[PDB]
């Protein structure tokens, strides 16, 4: 595999992943991380899958050609919120902006109170009720004395 | 029921079951072989009874309604009777959830929705079920701050996979009653189903992914997003010249 | 003297919670 | 004597803890700055801007990379929690300990997870998630803001927790210098904030029930609304209560009730016969079935 | 109590079999649990808290509709006196406690499929002999029947006596002040559901009044200006979400009792009800009263679907027949707003605005539902939402008569 | 009162109420509100102009 | 009059100061207005004891016209309004506002 003569598809329906960000301006090889990962696989169990992602940059930079091995077969990138939030714009790295879909009740002109898409997506800004229940004791309900 | 001198109606056993006899091959077996029976007796002395019968007397001009009015007054001053109601509700919710949890780990069971069925679950031995049931039972105890025995005793026979409640009594004439005690409609159980349905879509928020994993040498120099590949996956299973390793 | 009274604490809390600095030092200010 | 004392007095408390109230935010997911943004002071000046230099707490994370992670009750101001939580670390860490509830203890290594028992552990974790979220969305004092960024509606001032106030209403942000956060927040609709309606029953009293919109995810909201729905299910009018008590005493000790407005009472004190039957059977199963057990009874 | 009931199963909209899949049954009545009081276990205070907007069961009424269809496949004992099986599932016991897959040794006979089956309690003697435990069946069967009898909205009954409210009901209502309608509906359902009760019970009269008050306020006759013994309902602003109502008590002028006892049957004539919580709760709450007390009289056949013509013990056209009225929410809202202006609660300018807001709101409900139907064509074998045509949203129905009734009901 | 700094030597811009950046130079109308919330920037990019 | 002139939908009073900016007063806001007027009067006329406090301390200060009533079991309502007599200070105050 490291020689570029073989390609491997590891089949596993679901798993726990782990990320490890890196600067895209310096040399890097992902092999040691994977080799370490392999060094902990037993018949009993396995450690979480690792991944490496370059930190997005705010200026056009010179990137060192580095080698990667691992990547997924689907789009498992839903937990990502935004990149370079405190910056004017993301120049080089992947450019994720705040997706309006999770905030319909904050930016959608056609939003109606009392709607959602709960079984499919989670919205973070909604409308809700609040209460002020009191909890009277039994004697607070009735004339408790002899009858 | 109090039977009286009816030989065929004499009740010989009162019995309870912790397990559905339908699951195991006990559909048409003697009730005594399928339900556990009670056993208790109190030896009373006839002499004391006779004296009580013949030496009963009361106040000269007793008014029962008045006397009981005073007597029962302190017994209905607090929420004592209601705590048992609250415990019963929690017991109901705990029981349903525990059954739901165990069933979803088996391949099939008490017909219950299985939204998470795509995930893997290899061990289905009764030991796993017992461990799961204890986990659920302890979780409820912590959440609602209970101390007594909740949902326990079900695992007495050591196989929660077929736990079910029923009671019956047996008459000498061979008559049986065999009442069933199914749980009522819970609330939490439905919510938990909704949660699992939601999770199967938003699993990435729990550091859990889905799909296969590829390993290809790639000497990229620009942007690289492993979690969101833009190109189609190479050599999907069953493609040309792709080989599947042996099982050893 | 002229009459004044403090506002309710909740009013003050919100008001004090939102007070951006009037002068901020940044290197690019013409 | 223990059994006899137990069987004779029912006023031993030990009732399930039903009433738990939250005054914080009905959310279970926290926006998280995972990778901090770099501070530039020699070259590339002005490419990034922090709300810190304006003495303001940003309503959104402003790191280089931001993540959504599950953390139960992370904003739960108010009453003490149920006592069990779910707190995933950011995906730059292991986050495996959250999946070792069962079938893991003496079997897998500390730094692994059991791939063959994934379904069960996931299910249990979700169960814990559900139980931890069983609270009541309690109201709190509202007020109007006399500041310039007012929308005409009253908002929920989190006295003593100002950071909550900043987080609760992203619409109230102050935006200089058009950052990626600003490019999103600048689209916020003006009045989608604060109290929307209320049930004002008694003059000068606190509103019995109020409807508002704020930072709140749907899933936790669905859970808690079901929880109160359950509580309502085990409640009856005082007329029912007094009738029940009178009947229990065989119509002796016939008490009654006053007649006046009782705005917001709640007496979760009842159940169904099926639950009673179920508990009765379960209780019998728990105890031993010999003559030494029924004797105290 | 009440030792007898009558019922009618659902209608197949041209399809050959009852419309529900195994998953529907498995989710909505599974776990070997009792299905007999579950109707409110999947409802809440408002739509915003519910998963009624997408996926399976994408409507407020969706779940209860499927439940009714599900029951139609297993109520054979009240039609033929025998428990049966359908697609391998049957009752666990003669008491009909719960469902389970059929046993392998002595399966019961397979049910022969049919639609609009009339039902009698007398066909299954064990029911009466076990009335104390089989009581919950009574309520649900009644509810299913009251829905099955009509297209569009379900049918429910209204009545107001010539007497004032008894003190007991007054005290009970005074404790239900700030409660939203949905919670109130649950208690009514919970009350009549779990154990037999006599019609001469305080709660029965209490709920009866609630249905009356709800309708009177719905028509706008009962307001802050004019109230029934001090009570009335308050509706949310159409500008945000008018699908909400709460109870109120007030020192306004009290309406006089009618010259003679008033009563009628009601239903919503337009498909909006399928996704409008106030309609669902109001119907269920009202139906609960009839469940415990039985039907006061036969329902008029004159304005009912074809299968509802002349159903024994349920519908009739003779002398002892109570008419059934119907309405469309949009014209109803306009009438309610107009009454408010005449009472002086609002100005003319406000009234025009309210009509615009409510019409806009209703349009969204229609647009959602019509899009949802094509997403779930009934030919797929399950009916999450009742079919309709586009013109059905425009029917005015008998709305004019409806407000006239409230006019006579609260003088 | 957001301003929009730009790279590559382009001098900054200001957000028109039509949500389109415009050049600082020229004529402008400030409602009292926007000034009260953006004085910090105004003191550094508009006032000098 | 003062409270009515700060909530721009309230009890009908001549409004000479509507040209001035003012956010509409909620229930809590009006209470502060009610208090200040109360204090000003008690200071001006040197009065001890409560004069107007109940309007601020309890209920909604946004008053229109006070009224008291009792309810009979027969459903009849007996209501007695108490519209104030001709004030003098109010007139000159409105004049001061206008000028």
Residue numbers in the entry:
A (entry chain G): 1067 to 1213
B (entry chain G): 770 to 1017
C (entry chain N): 77 to 106
D (entry chain G): 176 to 472
E (entry chain n): 2 to 412
F (entry chain F): 1018 to 1066
G (entry chain F): 869 to 967
Can you list sentences taken from the study reporting this PDB entry?
Here we used a sequential symmetry expansion and relaxation approach to resolve the first asymmetric reconstruction of the ARV ICP by cryoEM to 3.3 Å. Lacking the outer capsid proteins VP5 and VP7, the ARV ICP retains the icosahedral, T = 2*, inner capsid shell composed of 60 asymmetric dimers of the 1214-residue, wedge-shaped, VP3 capsid shell proteins (CSPs) and 120 symmetrically arranged copies of the clamp protein (VP6) which form the ICP frame and provide support, respectively. Situated beneath 11 of 12 I5 vertices in ARV are TECs, heterodimers of RdRp and NTPase. Atop each I5 vertex sits a pentameric turret, composed of five copies of VP1 TPs with their axial channels reaching the nascent mRNA translocating pores of the TEC.
Five major dsRNA segments are observed adjacent to each TEC and are labeled based on their positions relative to the TEC, with a 6th segment observed adjacent to the template entrance in polar vertices. Within ICPs, several dsRNA segments interact with each TEC and these interactions stabilize segments, enabling improved visualization of their major and minor grooves as observed in other RNA viruses. NTPase has an RNA-binding domain (RBD) with its “tip” and “main” subdomains, an NTPase domain, and a C-terminal domain (CTD). The previously missing tip and much of the main subdomains are now observed extending away from the TEC core towards the template exit channel. The N-terminal residues of VP3A conformers were shown to associate with and lie along the exterior of the TEC, on both RdRp and NTPase, and were suggested to anchor the TEC into place. The VP3A3 Zn-finger also contacts the rear bottom genome segment, which suggests involvement in transcription initiation as observed in rotavirus. Despite expansion of the capsid shell, the Zn-fingers are positioned as in ISVP, suggesting the Zn-fingers function independent of the capsid shell. When ARV ICP and virion turrets are compared, we observe an axial extension of the TPs and widening of the axial channels. Local alignment of the 5 TP domains reveals the enzymatic guanylyltransferase (GTase) and methyltransferase I & II (MTase I & II) domains remain stable (RMSD 0.842 Å and 0.907 Å respectively) while domain separation occurs along the flexible linker regions between the GTase, MTase, and flap domains. This separation is enabled by the absence of the VP5 layer that would otherwise clash with the ICP turret conformation.
